[PDB]
Amino acid sequence: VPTPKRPRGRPKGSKNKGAAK
DNA sequence: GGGAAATTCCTC
DNA sequence: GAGGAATTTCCC
Structure with a gap:
């Protein structure tokens, strides 16, 4: 696994960045 | 327990 | 090289 996949x-902890239409 | 949103990896 | 599809997490 040499490529951090x-x-x-x-x-x-990822919240919505705005109004997802 | 189900639905909605954001991010990332793979194909041509 | 550029674009599309798949998977994970949080809240009620």
């Missing part, structure tokens, strides 16, 4: 997902 992060799993698809939403970081913890």
Whole structure:
């Protein structure tokens, strides 16, 4: 695992940045 | 227990 | 090279 591959997902503590239409 | 939103990895 | 699809987390 030489390439830090992060799993698809939403970081913890990530709130909505605005009005998601 | 279900729904909605944001981020990231893979294909052509 | 640029774009699309898949997976995870939080709140009621």
